[PDB]
Each structure stands twice: as C-alpha cells, then as structure tokens.
Design a protein around this ligand. Structure first.
Ligand SMILES: *[C@@H]1O[C@H](CO)[C@@H](O)[C@H](O)[C@H]1NC(C)=O
Lengths: 104, 103, 90, 99
C-alpha cells in the first residue's frame, strides 16, 4: 500500500491556552477531601497548546488540507479532540517511525 | 472566627508538629528506604545495621526536635496559664486595681 | 490465604504489607484505584483484590499500662488500667 | 478534567516522536473520494511541575494548582490551601544568578 497524499499547507500553528487542563490521577490510592502535592510530569496551566487540523477545509470549493506532521514526543504528550464524527483512531508512537525500534 | 485564634493557634501547632513528626517516618535520612522492614528484607543484616542507624539517628533526632518544641511550647502555655490563674484569682474572684490588666 | 475480618492479622495485599484489623468499610473507591490513604501517608484502607471490597486497616490497639496503686505502705494490691482499649484484648 | 489511568503497560521503549492516525474512505463518480468530514485536535507537551491536588468527598479532584505558575501560585502550595487568608506569606527565596 503506502498510498500517499502529502498536500503540504502553509500558515502558523494556531495556538490556544489550556486554562485548567490535563490533571490526571497519579496514583490508585483513594483520598477524600485532602490537599495532596506531588511533583510529576503534567501540562502546566495557562500553556501554549497547538490547535492542529488533520484535515482542514478552508472554503472555496472543497480544499481539504492534510497537514498532520510527525511530531516529537519530547517529555510527555497531551491530546484533546471533539470529533462528533470520529476520523481519529490511534497514534503511531515510536522513535524511528520505522523498523530498527519497536512501535506503539 | 478569628477571635479564638489564640486557642486555634495552640491546637494547630500541636497537630502541626504531630503531622511533621509523622511525615518524618517517610524520609530516607540517607538510608536506602523509609520502610524499616525493606532495609531488612533487601539487605543482609551486617550492612543493614549501618543503614538502620541513619533511620534511627534520623528519627531519634527527629523526636528530640519534637520533644524540645513541646517543652518550649509548653513553657509558653505554662506562662499563659499563670496569667489566667492570676486573672481568675484577681480579676474574677476579686476586683482588680491593676490598670488594663483586666482589659 | 483466607482473609481475616475483625481480628488482628498480619497481611499482604498485592504485595502491600502491614498489620492491622481488617473490617468492612463504606468509603467508595474509583475503579482503577488500589490503596486508600490518610492524612499521615499511612495505608488506611485497601481493596480486596479477589472480591472487590473496601477494607479498612486499623493496626491492633495498644496503650500504656498504668498501675494504679495506693502506697505499697497500705497494700500490695494494684488495679491495672489498660489505656485506650475496648475491654476484650485483655 | 480528571483522567484515570486506563492500562499500565510494560512498554520498555523510549518514544521520541509520533503522529496521529486517520479514518478516510472512498467515493464514486462525482465532479477518488478522501478526507471524510473535518478533523482537528489539540496537542501539548508535558513537564515536571508540583500540583496541589484537592480530592472531593468521593475522591473526584476538582481544583488543582501549579506551584511554579506565578509568584502567587507558589505561596498557595506553601499553605496547601485553596483559601489564602488576608496577610503576607513568605514564598520560596530567589537568587540572582551569575552571568
Ligand atoms: C467494649 O467492650 C465492652 C465489653 O467488655 C462492651 O460492653 C463495650 O460496648 C465495648 N465498647 C466498644 C468501644 O466497642
């Protein structure tokens, strides 16, 4: 297979501000109405967060823009989407994005 | 709710140091772990002896810190208690001629 | 090993080890969780892996023995006070 | 938004890069078909930070506060409280650093 349509598009990544976001439970331990403090990997509040578009119609007629880049993992990764109609399934996570390493 | 702060401060500071005193149990103090059994589980005793020292020396010290605080803090209360017992005797039981001792 | 309820037991759950009095408890865990904990970073409440249930951990009671006596002058008789227990473990 | 861990898996690999996946289809003769609907998502990178976590009576975390967010946020991590009483509080010291 490996059918491919790069359809590269210009313009700056549209950013946004995660206000209160990306707070998970970093333990199984059940706690009730207490203030617990840990230093762990998170997405810090008021952060810079890129609203990317995998497919983007900018109207004249059609013009679907397939932009989704290979993206570095860096320290850790957060993800968010709406997608009333699912078009998103999973992620390719890896290193070489090829053989010679494992692939998630 | 701030009128009672004097009392509220006493109760807090007591419960404060206790929390601190407890949390000192979970500190390594240079030992390989804060669980007294893990040092015994992982390591053969002859070395684990030196490890448990750093726990004991750490914890045993950490008591004297707590104890000394209580002694000092009690000595304050001991002073405040006499102030009450003085007021209770002079102010309540008698009538005080001491200006602004009773307020 | 068969679980012990309302009786001082050494225990291990999922590798978590301690010694306490395991009881039925109504505190309510979210599915993925394992432990509960208290303010002091003790292990307060655990969930039985095989049959999901919320089990408290209260380590077995203990307290200062207090020997109440008149002067040994007047008598050799003492009345012992076990502090802060239910009267069973005597 | 509180996120529970789904599965904790033995992965043992370092992942330095990635891309998402898509679901597209085929169409038939109209003036091949691709790019079903529209697609957009959000991405941000993690980072070590100290959060104070407020559980609820049912353990549902609502309020979380970063300590390093601003000089104001670092003091709330000293009192451990989301309520900060009127007054002056001493946040962590600062140092001038060498050029
Ligand atoms: C303690 O034990 C006595 C029986 O010796 C019983 O009557 C009492 O209700 C118990 N109290 C508690 C705290 O369970």
């Amino acid at each position: 297979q490996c059918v491919n349509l790069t359809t590269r598009t210009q313009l700056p990544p549209a950013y946004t501000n995660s206000f209160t976001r990306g707070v998970y439970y970093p333990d199984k331990v059940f706690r009730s109405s207490v203030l617990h403090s840990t230093q762990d990997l998170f997405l810090p509040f008021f952060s810079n967060v890129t609203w990317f578009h995998a497919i983007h119609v900018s109207g004249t007629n059609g013009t679907k823009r397939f932009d989704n880049p290979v993206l570095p993992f860096n320290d850790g990764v957060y993800f968010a989407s709406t997608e009333k109609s699912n078009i998103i399934r999973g992620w390719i996570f890896g290193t070489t994005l090829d053989s010679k390493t494992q692939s998630l | 709710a701030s009128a009672l702060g004097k009392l509220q401060d006493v109760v807090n500071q007591n419960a404060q140091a206790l929390n601190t005193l407890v949390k000192q149990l979970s500190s390594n103090f240079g030992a390989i772990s804060s669980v007294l059994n893990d040092i015994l589980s992982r390591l053969d005793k002859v070395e684990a002896e030196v490890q448990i020292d750093r726990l004991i020396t750490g914890r045993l010290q950490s008591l004297q810190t707590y104890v000394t605080q209580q002694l000092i803090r009690a000595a304050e209360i001991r002073a405040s208690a006499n102030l009450a017992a003085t007021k209770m005797s002079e102010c309540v039981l008698g009538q005080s001629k001491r200006v602004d001792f009773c307020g | 090993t068969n679980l012990v309820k309302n009786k001082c037991v050494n225990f291990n759950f999922n590798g978590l080890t301690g010694t306490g009095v395991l009881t039925e408890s109504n505190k309510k865990f979210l599915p993925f969780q394992q432990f509960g904990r208290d303010i002091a970073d003790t292990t307060d409440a655990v969930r039985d892996p095989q049959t999901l249930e919320i089990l408290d951990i209260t380590p077995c009671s203990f307290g200062g023995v207090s020997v109440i006596t008149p002067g040994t002058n007047t008598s050799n008789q003492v009345a012992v006070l076990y502090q802060d227990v239910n009267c069973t473990e005597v | 938004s509180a996120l529970e861990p789904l599965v904790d898996l033995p992965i043992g690999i370092n992942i330095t890069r990635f891309q998402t996946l898509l679901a597209l289809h085929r169409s038939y003769l109209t003036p091949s078909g691709w790019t079903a609907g529209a697609a957009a998502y959000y991405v941000g990178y993690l980072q070590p930070r100290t959060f104070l976590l407020k559980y609820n009576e049912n353990g549902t975390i609502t309020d979380a506060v970063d300590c390093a967010l601003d000089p104001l946020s670092e003091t709330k991590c000293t009192l451990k409280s989301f309520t900060v009483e009127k007054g002056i509080y001493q946040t962590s010291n600062f140092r001038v650093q060498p050029t």
